[PDB]
Design a protein around this motif. Structure first.
Motif, short mmCIF file in Angstrom:
data_model
loop_
_atom_site.label_atom_id
_atom_site.label_comp_id
_atom_site.label_asym_id
_atom_site.label_seq_id
_atom_site.Cartn_x
_atom_site.Cartn_y
_atom_site.Cartn_z
N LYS A 193 37.56 39.72 45.51
CA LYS A 193 37.96 38.73 46.49
C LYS A 193 38.05 37.37 45.81
O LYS A 193 37.10 36.94 45.14
N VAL A 194 39.20 36.71 45.94
CA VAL A 194 39.43 35.44 45.27
C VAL A 194 40.01 34.43 46.24
O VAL A 194 40.78 34.75 47.15
N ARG A 195 39.60 33.17 46.01
CA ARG A 195 40.05 31.98 46.77
C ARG A 195 40.88 31.16 45.78
O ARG A 195 40.37 30.86 44.68
N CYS A 196 42.12 30.83 46.15
CA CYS A 196 43.02 30.12 45.26
C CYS A 196 43.72 29.01 46.03
O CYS A 196 44.01 29.17 47.22
N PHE A 197 44.00 27.90 45.35
CA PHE A 197 44.69 26.79 45.99
C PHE A 197 45.71 26.19 45.03
O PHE A 197 45.49 26.14 43.82
N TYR A 241 50.15 42.03 44.53
CA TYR A 241 49.31 41.85 45.71
C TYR A 241 49.65 40.53 46.37
O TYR A 241 49.61 39.48 45.73
N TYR A 242 49.97 40.58 47.66
CA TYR A 242 50.48 39.43 48.39
C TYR A 242 49.37 38.83 49.24
O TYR A 242 48.63 39.56 49.90
N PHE A 243 49.26 37.51 49.22
CA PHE A 243 48.34 36.83 50.13
C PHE A 243 48.93 36.86 51.53
O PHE A 243 50.09 36.48 51.73
N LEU A 260 41.64 26.10 54.16
CA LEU A 260 41.85 25.00 53.20
C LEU A 260 42.52 25.56 51.94
O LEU A 260 43.09 24.79 51.19
N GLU A 261 42.40 26.86 51.73
CA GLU A 261 43.04 27.48 50.56
C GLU A 261 43.19 28.95 50.84
O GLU A 261 42.53 29.46 51.65
N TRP A 262 44.10 29.56 50.12
CA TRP A 262 44.50 30.96 50.17
C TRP A 262 43.34 31.86 49.76
O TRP A 262 42.52 31.49 48.92
N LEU A 263 43.28 33.06 50.34
CA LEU A 263 42.24 34.03 50.04
C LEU A 263 42.84 35.43 50.05
O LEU A 263 43.67 35.73 50.91
#
Ligand SMILES: *[C@@H]1O[C@H](CO)[C@@H](O)[C@H](O)[C@H]1NC(C)=O
Ligand SMILES: *[C@@H]1O[C@H](CO)[C@@H](O)[C@H](O)[C@H]1NC(C)=O
Lengths: 55, 292
Positions: free
Chosen positions: A1-5, A41-43, A52-55
């Motif tokens: 699981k990753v959080r990206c901005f 893999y698509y967000f 606040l950011e993509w996950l």
């Protein structure tokens, strides 16, 4: 699981860039590659009211 | 604006007392809708026939609508929907009106729809671009957008300051773009009102946020296009900028004495700005037009 901005001249996460790219219907893609592998893999598109950011 | 035209006048039979145009809107067909002294009126430019509008009972300040004209029935029925409202009215007790057919008939629109709202009403808009009905709602010094429809139903946009009032301009091609401007400020929305952001000004290839009130300039007119935006500031200034995604950049044009207390700018075509001034001729009573 990753959080990206998305990173622009502001290094901190911004709730405007996410809103812009979501209101255009754009979301990031992760491309995992190897010697013999290609995978994508698509967000999932989500409202930017809270995120606040993509996950 | 070629040739000379006599000023537009009220025939005086349907005396409307003072004749102040609070707003004007171009509906489908040869009709033009004016809000004169809080009352709706329709004027046919091929005739001289003025028709008062019976549906609107309470006084209204503005009439708002969106116009498509791809040749079909779709853009016609899209053009038919209209709103009539009194800008600045209390959120509860002001009566909003909707027109399903052109502007010919106006029906009052029911309150239950927006009880969950209290504050002044900056505007009620039909946003056909997003297939949504958005109300600009001012509950404090800041202003927001609320969307009545299912997804987002009653979903607030990001708040923006809103001291005083603002005039709202919708871009013709329903790309979703919006311009909110008054004397002391100009806000633009790449989005459909969800995110309302300041305009960035370019000076010597450095971009910086622009606050009209901060720089003390007073904007006298704005010209809005499908992709472009210009405004003329009362102290002989002219700014032209390209409104788009990733923010809007505005450059100040070289100096010219273009302001004369009657001047106004508009976009004749993409890339052609037009400064227009009516000159009054005493003998003929028809106004000449000084164009630049
Ligand atoms: C659906 O949208 C709401 C609104 O913000 C959000 O809180 C919720 O997490 C979303 N649900 C899913 C499953 O993405
Ligand atoms: C309207 O939206 C709210 C939340 O945005 C939701 O809880 C409710 O079920 C929706 N109702 C209708 C009638 O769409």
């Amino acid at each position: 699981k990753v959080r990206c901005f998305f990173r622009n001249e502001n290094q901190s996460p911004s709730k405007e860039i996410l809103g812009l790219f979501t209101s255009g219907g754009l979301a990031p893609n992760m491309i995992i590659t190897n010697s013999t592998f290609y995978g994508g893999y698509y967000f999932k598109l989500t409202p930017f009211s809270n995120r606040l950011e993509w996950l | 604006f070629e040739s000379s035209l006599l000023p537009l006048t009220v025939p005086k039979s349907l005396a409307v007392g003072v004749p102040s145009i609070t707003s004007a809107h171009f509906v489908s067909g040869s009709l033009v809708l004016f809000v004169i002294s809080g009352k709706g009126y329709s004027y046919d430019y091929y005739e001289n026939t003025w028709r008062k509008l019976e549906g609107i009972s309470e006084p209204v300040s503005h009439i708002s609508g969106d116009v498509c004209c791809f040749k079909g029935s779709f853009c016609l029925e899209l053009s038919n929907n209209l709103f009539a409202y009194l800008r600045g009215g209390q959120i509860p007790g002001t009566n909003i009106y909707f027109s399903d057919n052109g502007g010919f008939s106006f029906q009052l629109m029911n309150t239950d729809k927006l009880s969950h709202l209290t504050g002044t009403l900056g505007g009620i808009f039909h946003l056909h671009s997003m297939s949504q009905v958005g109300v600009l709602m001012v509950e404090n010094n800041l202003g927001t957008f609320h969307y009545m429809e299912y997804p987002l139903n009653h979903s607030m946009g990001i708040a923006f300051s809103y001291k005083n009032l603002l005039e709202v301009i919708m871009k013709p091609y329903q790309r979703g773009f919006m311009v909110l401007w008054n004397q002391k400020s100009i806000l633009v929305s790449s989005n459909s009102g969800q995110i309302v952001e300041h305009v960035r000004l370019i000076d010597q290839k450095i971009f910086t946020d622009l606050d009209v009130e901060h720089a003390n300039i007073n904007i006298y007119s704005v010209a809005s296009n499908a992709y472009e935006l210009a405004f003329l500031v009362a102290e002989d200034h002219l700014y032209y900028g390209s409104q788009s995604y990733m923010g809007t950049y505005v450059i100040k044009l070289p100096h010219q004495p273009l302001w004369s207390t009657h001047t106004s700018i508009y976009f004749e075509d993409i890339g052609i700005l037009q400064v227009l001034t009516p000159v009054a001729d005493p003998h003929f009573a028809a106004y000449d037009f000084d164009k630049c």
